[PDB]
Design an enzyme around this catalytic site. Sequence first.
Site, PDB file in Angstrom:
ATOM      1  N   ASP A 295       2.668 -11.946   5.984  1.00 40.93           N
ATOM      2  CA  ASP A 295       3.478 -10.733   5.918  1.00 40.93           C
ATOM      3  C   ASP A 295       4.703 -10.844   6.816  1.00 40.93           C
ATOM      4  OD1 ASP A 295       2.064  -9.418   3.995  1.00 40.93           O
ATOM      5  OD2 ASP A 295       1.106  -7.975   5.341  1.00 40.93           O
TER       6      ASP A 295
ATOM      7  N   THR B  84       0.802  -1.218   0.000  1.00 41.20           N
ATOM      8  CA  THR B  84       0.000   0.000   0.000  1.00 41.20           C
ATOM      9  C   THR B  84       0.835   1.267   0.000  1.00 41.20           C
ATOM     10  OG1 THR B  84      -1.573   1.317   1.276  1.00 41.20           O
ATOM     11  CG2 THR B  84      -0.163  -0.184   2.487  1.00 41.20           C
TER      12      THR B  84
END
Lengths: 528, 521
Positions: free
Chosen positions: A394, A97
């Site tokens: 992640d 992002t």
Amino acid sequence: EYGRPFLIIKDQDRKSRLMGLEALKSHIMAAKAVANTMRTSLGPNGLDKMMVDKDGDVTVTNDGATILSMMDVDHQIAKLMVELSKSQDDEIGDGTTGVVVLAGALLEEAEQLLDRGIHPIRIADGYEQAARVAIEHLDKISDSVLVDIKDTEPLIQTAKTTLGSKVVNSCHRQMAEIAVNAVLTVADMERRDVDFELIKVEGKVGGRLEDTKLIKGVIVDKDFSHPQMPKKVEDAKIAILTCPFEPPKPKTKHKLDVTSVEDYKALQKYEKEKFEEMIQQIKETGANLAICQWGFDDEANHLLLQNNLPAVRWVGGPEIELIAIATGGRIVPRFSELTAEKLGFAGLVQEISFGTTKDKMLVIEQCKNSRAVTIFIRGGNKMIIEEAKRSLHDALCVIRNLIRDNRVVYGGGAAEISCALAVSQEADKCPTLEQYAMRAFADALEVIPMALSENSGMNPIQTMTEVRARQVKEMNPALGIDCLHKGTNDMKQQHVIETLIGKKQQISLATQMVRMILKIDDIRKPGE
Amino acid sequence: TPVILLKEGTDSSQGIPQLVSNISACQVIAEAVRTTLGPRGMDKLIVDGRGKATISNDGATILKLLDVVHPAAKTLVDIAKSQDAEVGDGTTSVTLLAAEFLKQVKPYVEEGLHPQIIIRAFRTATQLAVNKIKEIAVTVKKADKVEQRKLLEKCAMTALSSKLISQQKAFFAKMVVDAVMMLDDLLQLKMIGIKKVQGGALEDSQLVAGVAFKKTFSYAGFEMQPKKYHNPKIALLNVELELKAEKDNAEIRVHTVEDYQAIVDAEWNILYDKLEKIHHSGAKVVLSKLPIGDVATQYFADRDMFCAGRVPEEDLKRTMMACGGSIQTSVNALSADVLGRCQVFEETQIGGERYNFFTGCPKAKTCTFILRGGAEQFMEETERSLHDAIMIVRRAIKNDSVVAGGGAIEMELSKYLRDYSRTIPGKQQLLIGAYAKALEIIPRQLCDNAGFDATNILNKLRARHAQGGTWYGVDINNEDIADNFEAFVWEPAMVRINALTAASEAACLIVSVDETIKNPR
Ligand SMILES: Nc1ncnc2c1ncn2[C@@H]1O[C@H](COP(=O)(O)OP(=O)(O)O)[C@@H](O)[C@H]1O
Ligand SMILES: Nc1ncnc2c1ncn2[C@@H]1O[C@H](COP(=O)(O)OP(=O)(O)O)[C@@H](O)[C@H]1O
Ligand SMILES: [Mg+2]
Ligand SMILES: [Mg+2]
């Protein structure tokens, strides 16, 4: 006569076209909308989105790549941002992002330059020059930390930083421990490589999120074949098989002719004897449990129980190759080839039962040194389980990069502020009309501290101005935004860490994407 | 009248109105690709019916994606593929030159000049134009080895100046040149493999002096076998190593169970014989186009040796050429010569995928590119620019004669034709003069795109050429003129020569059309 309607292209009326600056401006507006949709989801105080599928499925997520993947878009430039997000995710896995916000704010700063009379190739060249100056300064302030099983504290701190942005942060100290240990038990240090196919992530609904635990073995979604077998063993010697427990059958087309009664009886005897030899052959080798990939016959199932030998039926392909690695055994395709040197070992094999449901699972634990390991995820909702799986993925990827490269920088906007000043410092020496491009790059590099401050509830312009002045007076390139309201601004003391390759990928990837968007001056679409 | 000659719906037009309309039609085609020329050119984005988008700067590619149906315009499309199939570079140059030839003779057609006089004019100058290029082309026939490795780099960089990867042309040119000098003396294009893996910066591209391809589908047990060797021997196969039925036309009939058990053990003894024959040859890496069963993989795991199945045909041929073995359809004659030797083998992770690497072969005849982009259209456009560099080097090997680019060559030809038209009388003076005017479109389209004063620069160029400065072109950065032969702007002589003949042939064909008849459906 001169210009009477003459056809040049098939379906000439239904096709549209945009040329010139109105082509470039339309791309910028499309790019900005994607960045403003995902500005909110940046930083520890960020918020999430709730995706809705084609059929009605609901998914709540905060990962940058997934939002742009589940989104359905039509504008061609929007699909270019989606492909940009995925490329960063594959290479690194963290910072999906952040890159689109940097890319979006990089295009916005170019709108004024286009209007003032600059050829976009000059703008594209300028951005490339600035990135090179920013990157060489980025690893001038890096700090190599460590990679070793002995300490594991620096690795936990890095894992804590990445998990701090998700809903898993409720217990991210525990989850950090699981993630780091899982990598170091599969990591090959000499080849500097880790394989994710040796780490199995499985989640089951119910229970509590804090019940997540690390199992240094294998968990399978099966149970013992006969209901009356015992539910646990404590010195399991594992026999892994690939052939089914049935009388043989050649693959080529074949026929057997029964021409008399004695032929019939000799066939009947051959059936029941064949059932005995397989089970005898298993037992003489000293095996304690039998694992098979195919089914058993009714006769063979009972005989196993009568010989006090638990067994498992209809296991999966990838499961078998994991159990072979986990228990250290070997895979045999025939009963005849079975020996006592090919059996594995296992400290404990048990069947664990959950609550009201009939679901039962088998777990293999307490072996010797194992190159295979599984993560078990629990939680009160299917939407937590999906989120827990992605967030844990992640954490694993970030630790993987520390294996590859062992130097880090301090996040929280400290790296971006320090880089911007270095680029701005260089811009004062380049007088060949390229200076305007560089100042536009540095101004677009501060959009990450702005996005962090806005979410935290402070004022963007005041907060950045104070921090930048301090970094100039003092020689501290490690001052960021105090998004958690702790009092200090030094990210070194607050223990906020991000890997170096994460930052280099973000800057290099976004700049090269803009150099393709800015290079387009025409478009052709069929109308609807 | 009640019975009509040709069927209803037949369209028929002729005369000057028909011919002039064809000239204006070609102007639209040359418009789509006009602003894609130069060190400061742009791209175009085209979307087909299904929604897939293509971003390209290659001139030949844009014209293909357009759905042109005008019969006269289709001539300009075909000459694009002509320049594409012979030299590979110059697809837009041959298009602008085609349209400019027609536009400069359009007023004469309005005056009623006979087209056969126009046709004779074009063919006269082209033989003069071509013979001028070969005279003033610069070459060094003496065989210096380091000059050749410098000339090819200069030609390669100039072919990458107008592409998306212009900022790294010096880095890619070294890679391309090295690829060709070790590609045999026939230079098959299949001997070069280009791979595309997502994620990563553009500078992360690499060249492997060997063979590398993608991991294929593997069965259970692939993960307990070693993934690195130092001096392995490679055994290439075309034989399916899995337990199966011998022949689809086979059939077994048997009476007793004693033979039944013997038959069941016969299939296993066949399979174990082949696998024991391979293992005794001393090979460590086995590759086969056909599937490899799980039994073979588990067997190959127990002896620390590597297996791979369903390898693509093209990747196998390159492996044979790089390692130096041969494909075997039988396992009965595995001599020491049919094996392949490499200096190191490994399996690495590249952008989320797993790739097999065969590196270190000193007698290789094949290279492989690993391209790193950020999106699908980012590497596809990258490979299209690489293909222009590969073909340019291939032509330069056969003939090492270069001329200065940047419009320097178009002004030497135009000046030469202008000094020859004044010698001949009649209407042959106006036609050749108009021809020589069409040759200065290239220097104008370079300045128009960049954003200079295209009128002033042309005046300066025309005076320098007629003063007596043969190789003076345009200076993009400095907004002026300069010598492009000392500025290292080179291109092979074949690119311009093939540009004129195709352009002259297209202009002559179109002018020579009288009437067009279109029949229904
Ligand atoms: N404790 C913290 N204080 C300030 N900033 C933080 C903290 N933890 C993370 N960040 C910042 O949040 C930013 C965004 O991270 P995140 O929201 O997880 O998405 P992504 O990592 O994909 O950009 C990072 O640039 C990081 O520097
Ligand atoms: N350094 C340079 N200076 C001036 N002109 C250049 C330079 N590099 C390339 N060009 C110009 O680029 C033009 C053709 O570019 P290219 O894309 O190869 O055309 P085509 O699409 O016809 O192959 C040539 O006419 C040449 O003049
Ligand atoms: Mg993130
Ligand atoms: Mg070119």
